[PDB]
Amino acid sequence: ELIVYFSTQSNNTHRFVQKLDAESIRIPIDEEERIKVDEDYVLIVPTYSGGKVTDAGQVDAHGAVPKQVIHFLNDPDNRKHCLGVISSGNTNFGDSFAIAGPVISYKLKVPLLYQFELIGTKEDVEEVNRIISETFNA
Amino acid sequence: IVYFSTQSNNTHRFVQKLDAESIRIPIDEEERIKVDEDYVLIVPTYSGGAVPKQVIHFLNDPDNRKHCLGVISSGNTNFGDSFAIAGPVISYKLKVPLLYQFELIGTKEDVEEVNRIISETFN
Numbered sequence: 001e002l003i004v005y006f007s008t009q010s011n012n013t014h015r016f017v018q019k020l021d022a023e024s025i026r027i028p029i030d031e032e033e034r035i036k037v038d039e040d041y042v043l044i045v046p047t048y049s050g051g052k053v054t055d056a057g058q059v060d061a062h063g064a065v066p067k068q069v070i071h072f073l074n075d076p077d078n079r080k081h082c083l084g085v086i087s088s089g090n091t092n093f094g095d096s097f098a099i100a101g102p103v104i105s106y107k108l109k110v111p112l113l114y115q116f117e118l119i120g121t122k123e124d125v126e127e128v129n130r131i132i133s134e135t136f137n138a
Numbered sequence: 139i140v141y142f143s144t145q146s147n148n149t150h151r152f153v154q155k156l157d158a159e160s161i162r163i164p165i166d167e168e169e170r171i172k173v174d175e176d177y178v179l180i181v182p183t184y185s186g187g188a189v190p191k192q193v194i195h196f197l198n199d200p201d202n203r204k205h206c207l208g209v210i211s212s213g214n215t216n217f218g219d220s221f222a223i224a225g226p227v228i229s230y231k232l233k234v235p236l237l238y239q240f241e242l243i244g245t246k247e248d249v250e251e252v253n254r255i256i257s258e259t260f261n
């Protein structure tokens with residue numbers, strides 16, 4: 001069991017991932033630093049599009065996936081090991097809530113396993129532990 | 139499979155190409171159904187509220203909601219970043235995985251991929 005995650009200096013996603021059972025590897029905040037992951041992982045990432053909309057009024061997802069995660073997933077050696085994605089955010093962004101997940105899910109053709117807010121609740125920790133376990137069992 | 143499809147019938151035609159057995163949610167909003175076996179939900183996305191009213195009525199019943207193993211959603215990629223957004227909404231509300239997303243009537247790849255995914259889920 002292995003998690004790859006991203007978290008800005010606000011550390012919300014870090015504090016959620018710290019509570020989970022599985023081992024975790026952090027994608028660096030420093031944009032110039034890169035990592036290489038050798039084993040299969042579930043990806044956990046926050047959303048950063050700012051709840052933008054288009055002139056028509058539909059969701060604008062530009063910047064949903066943090067740039068550091070885009071660089072990470074651009075490497076096919078990293079990308080191939082992704083078993084699924086979990087995304088986070090804040091429901092105050094409405095239809096842009098947690099949209100980094102569906103964006104990544106559709107591009108990689110991997111399931112969007114879960115979505116949560118901020119540092120997560122006790123129930124999120126319980127569900128994600130189970131979900132990650134089941135994914136690695138399968 | 140449990141699915142919804144309007145008069146345009148795109149989601150219906152995709153589901154008939156799949157190997158698994160399927161049950162249809164009715165188009166008439168007053169008509170409602172009940173399901174007691176585990177199912178993967180497959181629904182299109184309709185904005186002016188991503189989820190069709192008929193699916194909202196279906197999922198509002200606690201007896202239907204408990205049997206969902208996961209959701210697959212569809213739409214049209216020309217809707218930009220509102221593409222297929224019924225799935226994520228349902229996924230988050232039910233706490234079930236969003237397994238796949240596809241366009242319209244689906245491609246050869248979608249048929250094979252959703253066949254594979256549904257088999258892995260039923261375990």
Ligand SMILES: Cc1cc2nc3c(=O)[nH]c(=O)nc-3n(C[C@H](O)[C@H](O)[C@H](O)COP(=O)(O)O)c2cc1C
Nearest residue numbers: 007008011012013046047050051089090097098118
């Ligand atoms: C500039 C900015 C833009 C954001 N945009 C979104 C968004 O589009 N959708 C969303 O659900 N959450 C959004 N959020 C909320 C964050 O994703 C959320 O606070 C998350 O917990 C931050 O994770 P981190 O502290 O690990 O970086 C945004 C936050 C900031 C600061």
Ligand SMILES: Cc1cc2nc3c(=O)[nH]c(=O)nc-3n(C[C@H](O)[C@H](O)[C@H](O)COP(=O)(O)O)c2cc1C
Nearest residue numbers: 143144146147148149182183185213214221222242
């Ligand atoms: C009024 C209307 C609104 C729609 N809104 C969306 C949307 O917000 N996002 C999307 O991805 N597709 C949207 N679509 C495309 C449909 O979801 C797509 O054609 C789907 O295949 C319809 O399935 P059905 O023929 O089974 O009803 C819309 C279509 C119509 C007619």
